[PDB]
Structure formats: structure tokens, C-alpha cells
Design an enzyme around this catalytic site. Sequence first.
Site, PDB file in Angstrom:
ATOM      1  N   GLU A  35       0.507 -19.164  41.441  1.00  0.00           N
ATOM      2  CA  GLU A  35       0.018 -17.969  40.862  1.00  0.00           C
ATOM      3  C   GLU A  35      -0.944 -17.247  42.310  1.00  0.00           C
ATOM      4  O   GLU A  35      -1.556 -16.161  42.292  1.00  0.00           O
ATOM      5  CB  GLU A  35      -1.562 -17.908  39.282  1.00  0.00           C
ATOM      6  N   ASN A  46      -3.146  -5.865  38.180  1.00  0.00           N
ATOM      7  CA  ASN A  46      -2.337  -4.866  37.560  1.00  0.00           C
ATOM      8  C   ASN A  46      -2.062  -3.628  36.362  1.00  0.00           C
ATOM      9  O   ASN A  46      -2.694  -2.856  36.889  1.00  0.00           O
ATOM     10  CB  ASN A  46      -2.821  -5.387  35.882  1.00  0.00           C
ATOM     11  N   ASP A  48      -2.107  -2.209  33.886  1.00  0.00           N
ATOM     12  CA  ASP A  48      -2.740  -1.547  33.165  1.00  0.00           C
ATOM     13  C   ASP A  48      -4.338  -1.507  33.644  1.00  0.00           C
ATOM     14  O   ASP A  48      -5.184  -0.773  32.565  1.00  0.00           O
ATOM     15  CB  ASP A  48      -2.926  -2.370  31.768  1.00  0.00           C
ATOM     16  N   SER A  50      -6.572  -3.684  34.826  1.00  0.00           N
ATOM     17  CA  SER A  50      -7.411  -5.136  34.547  1.00  0.00           C
ATOM     18  C   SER A  50      -7.055  -5.851  36.261  1.00  0.00           C
ATOM     19  O   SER A  50      -5.968  -5.362  36.839  1.00  0.00           O
ATOM     20  CB  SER A  50      -6.751  -5.685  33.577  1.00  0.00           C
TER      21      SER A  50
END
Length: 129
Positions: A35, A46, A48, A50
Amino acid sequence: KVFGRCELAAAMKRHGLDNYRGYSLGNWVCAAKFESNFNTQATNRNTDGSTDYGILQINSRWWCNDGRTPGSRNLCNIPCSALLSSDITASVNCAKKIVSDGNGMNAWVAWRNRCKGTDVQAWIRGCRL
Ligand SMILES: [Cl-]
Ligand SMILES: [Cl-]
Ligand SMILES: [Cl-]
């Protein structure tokens, strides 16, 4: 802060993540590796709109507030900036909520794609823990 591998394992254990919800410490270290490469200051935007924050790339759509993710929640009740601290407490406490949400560590797509089913103990091998 960029943690060393064993250093992060120790900090995670200190904060009760080892075997939390049945996930061994190596699972958590592996997830953090892919990560964030162990960097607490990691962020990623992201599609979207976010953003993912911190060593475990926790996402503002559900888990933290960043003031710029329309229609989102803040289920960990923290500013997303708290997830960037050199102190991993906020990331660990939030991760505990996330992994308890129903799908276990599959919440971290990177864990599913790169850690799940592998020899995750390799991630804590040699560590004084
Ligand atoms: Cl392990
Ligand atoms: Cl928001
Ligand atoms: Cl992935």
C-alpha cells in the site's frame, strides 16, 4: 516517516494488530508494504475523487474526513491527516474498524492481490518481536 520492516512489525504488535481478527502480523506488514512502501506520508487520489492516506492507504470515501470527498463518511471519526503521522496509532485503530467491517482484509485490494495466500510470515522473518 518511512518505517523499517521489523520496526513497523513491532509498532503494529505494540498497537494490538498482531492476529487482530485472525490476521497474523505478516499479513499487516505485507499490506503496508504494497500500500505505502512503509511510508506514513503516502497519499493517492482515486478515480472517484476520494483519497487514500497513510501506511495502510485508508480511504476518505468511508473512513476519514478530508473535506473534499463529496457524499463520503468518516467512520473512524478522524481527519485523514491523522493517518499521515509518524505515530501509527490512528492508522491502526482505524484499520481495526475496517477489517471488522465484513470482508476482512479484502478491504485492502492490494492485500487481496499481492498478500492473500502467500507466505506472509516472510515479512516478519528475523524480526525481534
Ligand atoms: Cl505472519
Ligand atoms: Cl468530504
Ligand atoms: Cl493491487
